[PDB]
């Protein structure tokens, strides 16, 4: 092979530093330690990238995830061996579940100490095998550029995801003394395959042109291409097809559009769920038919199943990964590869549709029958969490600024999903597949680093926020003016919801003792605001959003409020529990009796 | 025939509750979630044990470790699937490295959903394989009692360690219909081997009786038996053998005893290191010759190696785990099994030594010329961190209470180890093998739960404390009046030491921005105290330990103060860097010069 000598004489650490600029890395999230010292010495004062220092490595990981979701670039993490590495397992597993591109670099003990139960040695490659797309231990400095290039390529192609690169201390401290192949130092289709994909596209167009009640079921995959939302909208307009998104597709479709069905699934709106259950054709675009979406699989999409049996519909799946094709539902047509690219190729084959009067009339009736109803504020009552989301959504949107929302995990997360009006791609950043509490704050910090001009709001739960609240001071140190909203119901609400519904109001260890959030914000160097009274909510939300610098707003909200609608257990998507104020009142009395007045 | 029907009609969750009682568990540390709901329902209002709720599952893990180190009982952790499980990887790796008995129960998605990339599904058995002695996924409720009994047995036998038991939701929700073998529901050596051990004991006695300059090298293994320290003291008195301990053996030997050599190793005292390098016989008791202890292995113990070649000494190893014998160093005699048990069998074969005048004269000369020296306070100077430990040591002892000390990781940890006078077993609880920053606070909480009557002090670093400071509120909820001391040098001191020494004072990302610790303590519901002035120190320390409830004391200490002595790099144990006041003053000028005054 051709040889490259440009790195000869540099340490592994210096080569790392150089590769970052070559991989277009502008930001690194990390925390130093012994094993990774030679790399830290090499990036000392580097103007190649901004370095962000969290208080805990899990924070670096979630920051990198938020950065990635906001920027479209891989999040880069740099931590030490042992506990440095084990502390990023959660964010890696999280990134793997949600398809987030991340490259995690972990220091490792010298190669000669590996396998001796050495100081701060973990089998990181073993530990992270099942929660990365790929991982590797670099065994020589000669190998370092190759592994870095492979890592970035793997993380950002196919379905994006995390990769881990283990860096032994002797490798990063070693000087490169051999020339290395030029192929290894530079970053970065079958004809029958292309023709096959084009065939599948022709068939997909044929099926779509045949459908009388189609639904577009859209997920995160459409957001992995700049033109995704635009092409989705063009197809929806051209063929008059209503659009529902998963939790992770929120923002990919303008919810102000009359063809918007909002979110489907366990806590999706009834209209989206009913449309899916009655559709003759489901066009799945960058979504993986997760169990939180389909409800009971045997009851899922009966009209599409009927249509398939009669050769006049079923399910079309635009999917980039073979692992996810036919994994859950039998698929009539799989269109393999990037969804956006394939929609573009399909477009001209779709017959323009004048109208779908009957289908849209039915959908509009469902919209009138089943809004996201809930128990609203009454005199003397506590503030309702759903109301907070609705008001903040309007206040934030009215600034005219680009707005990005992150969340923790639980009821507040579902209410954010439901009651915010989603209009822009890459503006909702939430932990869906793994559902990691504590995601909200560091993800917001990372997102703010990616988009310094954006209004970044973490809509968080009190228990979620406790998980990673130490990163408040990191936000100040990083100069990220994040807006932290805590919907404080003094409970792990999502868990108490399940305990209310399925365990006869037995609240087993679901009430953590919260700190004073306002004094905490002040201790951490932020402005802290609290609202308790209905009458002050509007003014406080405006002050919150208008504040220059990072700010925390705690809203005391009502407790034991269920997220509805809800599809759970053996229920099909059309068998949801709906909001009913009389039932809520009865369940409240029942709860007080069963808990002996404790809750 | 011998089938048991007492669990018939119980859910797996309810069986779990009963099994905790049979295993004499009095405390469970955990955090609930969806997959583990059936177990939480079953333990709701349980009178079998107390439950401790942290803010983060890593907190649960470290609390359980602290609880285990202080009580001698396995720490039990109960968390949910997915992120709940991945959040306990660090404590498991930590407990694995330090040999701490822990049984981790993780909820898992239903067996039907396993392997489908389900909601909150992680491959927990795969992930935790390298950091547990043993793990298992329970596949039927019939199998549940068996796996629980196996878990506890493995965790507490041989070298103690963490085990993981994965609990699918359908298994814990399932009702046992079938009788199960009675033996599976009840908790819990060849005479050839016994003779072989006896043979080794005989040979080891002869070698000891022959030694002229013997050293007892004592580790954590001696603390795994109630009679350990007693038998250690007996052997030391009888054969007049000086005793040095590892970091993890601290407290096993009375440091007030004239035969104490204090701690050996990288930051051990000079006398201990010199004694080890000049010994003709090293008697290793429950210690694994870690790289932080031996220094450059090829320079380690030359006098014992010399003696081994002439058949007049060498190394004796009392080790419970066969894989840790002849793992680091060539051993003349290995005594397999429990160290304490084997010391008891050996004692009567040891010849009582009158005196070792020459050996102890040499040792006492070293003690006089190489004490733990450091730069002491001067008028107008900042408080020295070594001085705080010394004073706190005395103030804590004067309370008359049983004192337990935990720490974070870094310089403060080494200073705690060096400058405290250790006299009682199971009173120093620190992360040694993995070295996990953030260990200090949750370990203290766990220790306080184990020993409600003890004075528990977390001597912590500012950076370490930031890692897990959210658990402050958990301490209040748990009713544990821990005393938290922060030696605040506004730096990752241990890392800056290495950067000062080996990287020409290039401080790459080792200065994190701290919150106001006093305001933080108050927000968290604790009393907060601060000391800046030398004159205030004694009074504040006294107020600190005299405070009834939980309390945080921040002491502002001098920065860029190295931990000495220090053995690093290619250095042997006798080639340590020692303290010198003029060199320190020179280092200060050099540092100021190189940092432009910033550090
Ligand atoms: C408390 C809670 C409640 C929840 N309830 C709901 C709910 O009610 N409704 C809901 O929808 N979700 C819900 N979830 C989230 C759910 O668990 C999943 O995370 C989510 O549904 C996954 O959405 P997705 O399929 O669009 O994204 P992903 O999981 O990221 O899947 C994307 C799919 O598109 C593919 N893909 C990626 N890139 C491309 C590309 N360039 N071209 C083509 N294909 C591509 C991927 O391979 C993958 O198959 C909930 C989560 C939590 C924590
Ligand atoms: C910043 C830092 C600095 C450090 N510097 C030092 C230092 O200067 N000096 C030092 O000593 N440590 C130091 N360490 C700690 C070091 O890394 C190890 O954790 C420590 O040396 C291990 O001590 P140990 O061998 O006694 O315990 P362990 O690691 O737990 O090993 C105990 C051995 O005894 C065996 N054993 C267990 N139970 C029994 C039994 N019942 N019978 C017989 N055998 C048994 C075990 O199998 C094992 O082989 C440092 C750590 C940090 C974070
Ligand atoms: C981090 O451990 C190692 O990389 C390691 C492990 C096993 C064998 C050899 C090494 C390399 S090392 O002996 O030179 N130590 C090192 O690189 N860093 C180092 N940093 C400290 O504080 C930052 C403290 C400290 O020991 C307590 N070691
Ligand atoms: C934890 O996930 C499951 O155990 C699981 C995963 C895949 C398939 C089936 C299940 C069981 S389940 O559908 O009945 N859900 C469940 O047990 N808990 C549950 N808890 C929530 O918050 C407490 C929220 C929530 O979905 C958002 N699911
Ligand atoms: C790390 C982690 N631990 C446990 C869970 C299980 N869990 C899911 S939602 C939830 C409660 C969240 O409470 P909160 O953050 O306050 O949001 P709320 O539902 O009250 O709005 C819990 C404990 C989880 N998702 N992640
Ligand atoms: C989780 C984790 N991350 C990183 C490290 C690397 N590390 C070891 S000691 C140290 C500095 C600790 O600073 P501090 O807690 O303030 O103690 P100090 O040395 O200043 O007394 C670091 C960053 C570690 N041991 N653990
Ligand atoms: Mg909406
Ligand atoms: Mg809550
Ligand atoms: Mg001492
Ligand atoms: Mg410090």
Curated annotation (Swiss-Prot), chains A, B:
Residues where FAD binds: 159, 267-288, 319-338
GO biological process: branched-chain amino acid biosynthetic process; isoleucine biosynthetic process; L-valine biosynthetic process
Cofactor comment: Binds 1 Mg(2+) ion per subunit.
Regulation of its activity: The regulatory subunit ILV6 stimulates enzymatic activity seven- to tenfold and confers sensitivity to inhibition by valine and activation by ATP.
Note: Contains 1 molecule of FAD per monomer. The role of this cofactor is not clear considering that the reaction does not involve redox chemistry.
Assembly notes: Homodimer. The acetolactate synthase complex contains the catalytic subunit ILV2 and the regulatory small subunit ILV6.
Protein name as catalogued: Acetolactate synthase catalytic subunit, mitochondrial
Annotated organism of origin: Saccharomyces cerevisiae (strain ATCC 204508 / S288c) (Baker's yeast)
GN (gene name): ILV2
């Amino acid at each position: 092979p051709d040889m490259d000598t440009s790195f000869v004489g540099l340490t592994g650490g210096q080569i790392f530093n150089e590769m970052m600029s070559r991989q277009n890395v502008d930001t690194v999230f990390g925390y130093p330690g012994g094993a990774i010292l030679p790399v830290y010495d090499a990036i000392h004062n580097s103007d190649k990238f901004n370095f962000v220092l969290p208080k805990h490595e899990q924070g670096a990981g979630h920051m990198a995830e938020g950065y990635a979701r906001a920027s479209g670039k891989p999040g880069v993490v740099l931590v030490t061996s042992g506990p440095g590495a084990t502390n990023v397992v959660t964010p890696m597993a999280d990134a793997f579940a949600d398809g987030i591109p991340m490259v995690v670099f972990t220091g490792q003990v010298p190669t000669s100490a590996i396998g001796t139960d050495a100081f701060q040695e973990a089998d990181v490659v073993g530990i992270s095998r099942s929660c990365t797309k790929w991982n590797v231990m670099v065994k020589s400095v000669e190998e370092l550029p190759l592994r870095i290039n492979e890592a970035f390529e793997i993380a950002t192609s196919g379905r994006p995801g995390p990769v881990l690169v283990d860096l032994p201390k002797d490798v990063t401290a070693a000087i490169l003394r051999n020339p290395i192949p030029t192929k290894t130092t530079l970053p970065s289709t079958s004809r029958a395959q292309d023709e096959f994909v084009m065939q599948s596209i022709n068939k997909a167009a044929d099926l779509i042109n045949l459908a009388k009640k189609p639904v577009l079921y859209v997920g995160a995959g459409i957001l992995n291409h700049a033109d995704g939302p635009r092409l989705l909208k063009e197809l929806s307009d051209r063929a008059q097809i209503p659009v529902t998104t998963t939790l992770q597709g929120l923002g990919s479709f303008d919810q102000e559009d009359p063809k918007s069905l909002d979110m489907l699934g366990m806590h999706g709106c009834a209209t989206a769920n009913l449309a899916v259950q009655n559709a003759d054709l489901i066009i799945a675009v960058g979504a993986r038919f997760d169990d939180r979406v389909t409800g009971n699989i045997s009851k899922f999409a009966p009209e599409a199943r009927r249509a398939a049996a009669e050769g006049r519909g079923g399910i079309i799946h635009f999917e980039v990964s073979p692992k996810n094709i036919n994994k859950v539902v039998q698929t009539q047509i799989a269109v393999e590869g990037d969804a956006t690219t394939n929609l573009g190729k399909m477009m001209s084959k779709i017959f323009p549709v004048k109208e779908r009067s009957e289908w849209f009339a039915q959908i509009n009736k469902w919209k009138k029958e089943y809004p996201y109803a809930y128990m609203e504020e009454t005199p003397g009552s506590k503030i309702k969490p759903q109301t907070v989301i609705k008001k903040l959504s309007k206040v934030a949107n009215d600034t005219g600024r680009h707005v990005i929302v992150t969340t923790g995990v639980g009821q507040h997360q579902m209410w954010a999903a439901q009651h915010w009006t989603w209009r822009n791609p890459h503006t909702f950043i939430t932990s869906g597949g793994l559902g990691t509490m504590g995601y909200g704050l560091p993800a917001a910090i990372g997102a703010q680093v990616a988009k310094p001009e954006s209004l970044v709001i973490d809509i968080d739960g009190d228990a979620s926020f406790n998980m990673t609240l130490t990163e408040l001071s990191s936000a100040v140190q990083a100069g990220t003016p994040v807006k932290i909203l805590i919907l404080n119901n003094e409970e792990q609400g999502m868990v108490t919801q399940w305990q209310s519904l399925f365990y006869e109001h037995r609240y087993s260890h679901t009430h953590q003792l919260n700190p004073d959030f306002i004094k905490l914000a002040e201790a951490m160097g932020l402005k802290g605001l609290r609202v308790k009274k209905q009458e002050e909510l509007d003014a406080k939300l405006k002050e919150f959003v208008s504040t220059k610098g990072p700010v925390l707003l705690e809203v005391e909200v009502d407790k034991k409020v269920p997220v509805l609608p809800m599809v759970a257990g053996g229920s099909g998507l059309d068998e949801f529990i709906n909001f009913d104020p009389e039932v809520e009142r009865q369940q409240t009395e029942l709860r007080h009796k069963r808990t002996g007045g404790k809750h």
